Design a protein around this nucleic acid. Structure first.
Lengths: 60, 144, 226, 87, 185
RNA sequence: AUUCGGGUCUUGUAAUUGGAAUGAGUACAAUGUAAAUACCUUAACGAGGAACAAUUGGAGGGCAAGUCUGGUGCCAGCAGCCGCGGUAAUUCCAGCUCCAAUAGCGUAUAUUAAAGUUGUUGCAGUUAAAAAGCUCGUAGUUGAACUUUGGGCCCGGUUGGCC
RNA sequence: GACCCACUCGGCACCUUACGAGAAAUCAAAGUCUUUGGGUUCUGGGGGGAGUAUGGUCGCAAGGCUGAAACUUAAAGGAAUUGACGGAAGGUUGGUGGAGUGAUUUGUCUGAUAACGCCCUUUGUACACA
């Protein structure tokens, strides 16, 4: 195939997109604590309607 | 009796037939003929380090219509003319004409990655820094 | 409101089930009496739960444009030792599923589960090496020792967990990706367990008398005006 | 068909065939059970009592079930001659 | 060069990594017993696996065989001294059955909770990994352990560190000295 | 269980808050050692948040987790495979939240398993690749049955239960 | 000598079943195979590249026989099914039940009865935005 091409657009999208920053938050407790936290949110109560459950619910 | 000889004292014909009929599969052929070492761009090694030649604008196949932005590279060891894709968004402006870059293969082992004709290698490092580190703003490229 | 339950015992088994003459399914299994109504095996043993398995669409080109339908493979079972596989196809999904469950309930089959080698309390594995076929897919079921688990594909594994087969090895041949064939093969295999003479079954029993003849005058197809 | 300590497990003991002794099974609908009533002097049927015969599905499919039934009932003793053992 | 110090890995990864049945069930164990990783579970299932295959290899040979007897009695007695298998089923066919739950029960992380005093299993783990508690005179600082039956009644707080005796600690030193007593000049 | 007494266990959510226990780390001493460094010890110190902060890959399907929010508009790119992008992207770029493994993960090339896709156990050869035009024929492979069973007499070890 | 009747061996094939086998179409053998061993010669391993190049060997020649790789691709095919098409031939839809491993078909049909309550049929198809 052809070698010539429009290389001027190399990194078009990476540049023009808006460069905002990360939000700081409360610290995620790591290791065994994280596992505990996972266990709690899963095996307590809250799930979606029907038999199936969504672990990451979208707000709607 | 199902084609092959089930004789007790006929091991010869069994082993010989198998040895004749092993020549079919990929791995057996690639190993015993010595095809990795004789032929092919790399010398049967994972990563081959190379210079460059020029930047390209590869016309991609249907249906995936785009331009891929690869590089023609001449290697150090054999010094064969090779084509090699450059990963991530942007990142062709990092590399220039003449520059020490360490290449890696795609994954598929020979032949095209996906939609890129002729190109069977990606990159890893440029000036010994990693493209992945540069794309993600971690490390800095040296001027020389 | 203006509702009523309405069992409607058509055929000769319905009346028997309603009256409560036959308590277990063992009699049915013995005499091979074909279960037409799905409500027979339901109230006969309430412990018979359920399960789904897989849903795939099946299409149909036509004059106007294109018809589409949904096939549902519904395997149902219970952890003692009875299972059913019910394949069904309909235009609605729920309608496909319900009908599939009905079909699965209709055609239930028991499993002759035994031991690996030693004799102990409670059977766990299959009695023999059984195999079932359907198209290219031949599924084989090999007996395994205690606490070995169900070493198989996720679908076949589920089918076996439903039955209450705790420990069993499996293999397969052909293009196993299709569950249409594979689960049918598994069903055929678990079915052929009872169609295999072990030495303990050579002890010839007297042939039990058919229960249909015992209660023919009492509960059967009566005339009845209104 | 038992466990170690007595207690007979293995639910449902299958029906053996009368003709070939192959196991007739749960799903198989081609199989048949013939019931023959017990006659005596003073004529008449005498209900309650039956000489039973379980014919298999295969035997019926193949189409030599008749011959088998002629054999089976004879050795019980309700056919003078009829079916010769020899051929 | 001298002879090598031999080595071999204790964990054994599963075949299929993303499966709905396994990931949900195994994480419950981790949440109950308070296991930090899945690696620990896999280790326990690897030891158990080895025991299982050994038992199977014992059972393929005939009864009243020299190999089957000796090895059986020692395997069974090992499983008894650790306390996984109780006295009722000392038959060799029962060790094939078994389960991972029993093994995790027998770990010293939870045996402190099963005794009591440590309130939560997580708290017990913390106590263990922070140099408190002891099997007898010998202090232990590792959650995973396998308590060897006789050791059960001797489990208590160590002589060093509080609860057992000795000094208070760091925080209490700061409260008693740097805060409480330091108010008066 | 005197049903109208107060709080042990709490299922989770809450920068609302009060103490408690430590290590990582700094180090008197001692030990350790050919002599040190470490380890093991342990005086004197050293947790409450940008503190002493854990990441690495993913979030269409395969494969576990998103039809959430803005930019881009077959362009840049992602994509092992199928395929996404022509201006509402559950696949791109970011951010929110979630999932995996977790002081460890990803990427290459080689290789083992799955591959009963080398097949002796254990493949296929009518039509999918494959039976050689057919016959002879040397090596090679394989090749009918038939050439002493039975009967006893004792001696006598091993299994399990009344003894 | 011929024919008829009954039996007989050796084939030429045929007609009906499906016991079994096969993914199917179909098969008295392609059966007696995961319940995977009667003996034994020959050939194949995704498709293109290529029955090409190179080498030998055979032949007066044409060609035969033996017979690759690099490179390239995510298919290629086989069977059957619904439509669609033909410059081929003739003149609507579920319920339950069968026929099938399904796609589906039968019903909803030759002009009775596996069914019970421009249009069509059969065949050909490498098309299936037809």
């Amino acid at each position: 195939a052809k070698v010539h091409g429009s290389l001027a657009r190399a990194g078009k999208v990476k540049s023009q997109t808006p460069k905002v920053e990360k939000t700081e938050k409360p610290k995620k407790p790591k290791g065994r604590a994280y596992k505990r936290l996972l266990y709690t949110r899963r095996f307590v109560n809250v799930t979606l309607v029907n038999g199936k459950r969504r672990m990451n619910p979208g707000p709607s | 009796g199902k084609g092959k000889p089930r004789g007790l004292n006929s091991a010869r014909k069994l082993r010989v037939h198998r040895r004749n009929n092993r020549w079919a599969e990929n791995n057996y052929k690639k190993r015993l003929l010595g095809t990795a070492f004789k032929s092919s761009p790399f010398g049967g090694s994972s990563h081959a380090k190379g210079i460059v030649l020029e930047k390209l604008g590869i016309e991609s196949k249907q249906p995936n219509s785009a331009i891929r932005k690869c590089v023609r590279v001449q290697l150090i060891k054999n010094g064969k003319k090779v084509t090699a894709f450059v990963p991530n968004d942007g990142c062709l402006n990092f590399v220039d004409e003449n520059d020490e870059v360490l290449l890696a293969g795609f994954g598929r082992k020979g032949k095209a990655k996906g939609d890129i004709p002729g190109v069977r290698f990606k990159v890893v490092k440029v000036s010994g820094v990693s493209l992945l580190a540069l794309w993600k703003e971690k490390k800095e490229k040296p001027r020389s | 409101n203006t509702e009523e339950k309405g069992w409607v015992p058509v055929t000769k088994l319905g009346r028997l089930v309603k009256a409560g003459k036959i308590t277990t399914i063992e009699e049915i299994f013995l005499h091979s009496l074909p279960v037409k109504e799905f409500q027979i095996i339901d109230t006969l043993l309430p412990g018979l739960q359920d399960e789904v398995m897989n849903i795939k669409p099946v299409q149909k080109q036509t004059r106007a444009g294109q018809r589409t339908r949904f096939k549902a493979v519904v395997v149902v079972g219970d952890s003692n030792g009875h299972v059913g596989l019910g394949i069904k196809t309909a235009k609605e999904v729920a309608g496909a599923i319900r009908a599939g469950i009905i079909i699965a309930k209709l055609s239930v089959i028991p499993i002759r589960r035994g031991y690996w080698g030693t004799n102990l309390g409670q059977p766990h594995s299959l009695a023999t090496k059984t195999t079932g076929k359907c198209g290219s897919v031949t599924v084989r079921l090999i007996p395994a020792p205690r606490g070995s688990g169900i070493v198989a594909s996720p679908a076949v594994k589920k089918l076996l967990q439903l039955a209450g087969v705790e420990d069993v090895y499996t293999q397969s041949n052909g293009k196993t990706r299709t569950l249409e064939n594979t689960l049918k093969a598994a069903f055929v295999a678990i079915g052929n367990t009872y169609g295999f003479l072990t030495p303990n079954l050579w002890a010839e029993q007297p042939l039990p008398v058919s229960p249909l003849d015992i209660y023919s005058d009492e509960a059967s197809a009566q005339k009845k005006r209104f | 068909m038992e466990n170690d300590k007595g207690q007979l497990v293995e639910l449902y003991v299958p029906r053996k065939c009368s003709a070939t002794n192959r196991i007739i099974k749960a799903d198989d609908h081609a199989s048949v059970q013939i019931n023959v009533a017990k006659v005596d002097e003073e004529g008449r049927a005498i209900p309650g009592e039956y000489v039973t015969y379980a014919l298999s599905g295969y035997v019926r499919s193949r189409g030599e079930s008749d011959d088998s039934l002629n054999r089976l009932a004879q050795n019980d003793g309700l056919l003078k001659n009829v079916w010769s053992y020899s051929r | 060069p001298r002879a090598p110090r031999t080595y071999s890995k204790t964990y054994s990864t599963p075949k299929r990594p993303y499966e709905s049945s396994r990931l949900d069930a195994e994480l419950k164990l981790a949440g109950e017993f308070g296991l930090k990783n899945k690696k620990e579970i896999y280790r326990i299932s690897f030891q158990l696996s080895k025991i299982r295959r050994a038992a199977r290899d014992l059972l393929t040979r005939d009864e009243k065989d020299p190999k089957r007897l000796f090895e059986g009695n020692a395997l069974i007695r090992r499983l008894v001294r650790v306390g996984v298998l109780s006295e009722d089923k000392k038959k060799l066919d029962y060790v094939l059955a078994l389960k991972v739950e029993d093994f995790l029960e027998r770990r010293l992380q939870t045996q402190v909770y099963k005794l009591g005093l440590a309130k939560s299993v997580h708290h017990a783990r913390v106590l263990i990994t922070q140099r408190h508690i002891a099997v007898g005179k010998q202090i232990v600082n590792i959650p995973s352990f396998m308590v060897r039956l006789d050791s059960e009644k001797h489990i208590d707080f160590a002589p060093t560190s509080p609860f057992g005796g000795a000094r208070p600690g760091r925080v209490a030193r700061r409260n008693a000295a740097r805060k409480a007593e330091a108010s008066g000049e």
